[PDB]
Design a protein around this ligand. Structure first.
Ligand code: FE
Ligand code: FE
Length: 201
């Protein structure tokens, strides 16, 4: 399974290296939002077999990551700030169809795409950050993020015919790329999911 339809632009890596704390603060918010989305999915699908078993530990792990990143934020002299989120999240949310069974499928695939893009960008910072502490943080988070997009795939595969999943993911993956197109307005506007994608392939 290939989740993402295009890689992040080196432009984003440069911007993230220039304003690491804005990325880090946004990242803490992203982990908490991921936990929240998992809990909201569980409420929507209250008694769905297997779902609580899968999403409850995921939400806990996302909260652990939130707490870990928050501790580093404070070790670097800052706190959680209300940095406005990029348009990415809302752009992806808009792709989720109303009505079951399409809604569940779209919800899992959107969550998985967001996780895959976070993993892809964290992998870039793990290698390219000039700060060893940040390389270590981001490296430490990679394995778990890969388990998370893996989980969202498995949740689809358990409930839906495979080609339905593949076809919808292709559509959503192109929307995810469109959601990252554009140029950053100001250096301090960089975020985990701010603009910067290479569409040339
Ligand atoms: Fe996480
Ligand atoms: Fe995750």
């Amino acid at each position: 399974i290939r989740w993402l339809a295009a890689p992040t632009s080196w432009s984003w890596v440069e911007q993230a290296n220039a304003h690491p704390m804005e990325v880090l603060i946004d990242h803490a918010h992203c982990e908490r939002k991921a936990a929240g989305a998992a809990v909201q999915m569980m409420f929507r699908y209250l008694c769905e077999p297997g779902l609580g078993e899968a999403l409850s530990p995921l939400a806990r792990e996302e909260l652990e990551h939130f707490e870990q990143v928050l501790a580093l934020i404070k070790a670097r002299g800052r706190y959680l700030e209300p940095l406005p989120s990029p348009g990415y999240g809302a752009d992806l949310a808009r792709q989720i169809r109303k009505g079951e069974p399409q809604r569940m499928l779209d919800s899992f695939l959107v969550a998985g795409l967001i996780e895959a893009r976070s993993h892809e960008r964290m992998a870039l910072l793990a290698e390219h950050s000039p700060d060893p502490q940040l390389r270590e943080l981001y490296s430490d988070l990679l394995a778990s993020e890969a388990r998370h997009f893996g989980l969202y795939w498995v949740l689809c595969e358990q409930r839906y015919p495979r080609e339905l999943i593949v076809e919808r993911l292709e559509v959503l993956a192109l929307a995810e790329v469109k959601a990252l197109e554009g140029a950053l307005t100001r250096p301090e506007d960089v975020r985990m999911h701010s603009c910067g994608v290479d569409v040339t392939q």
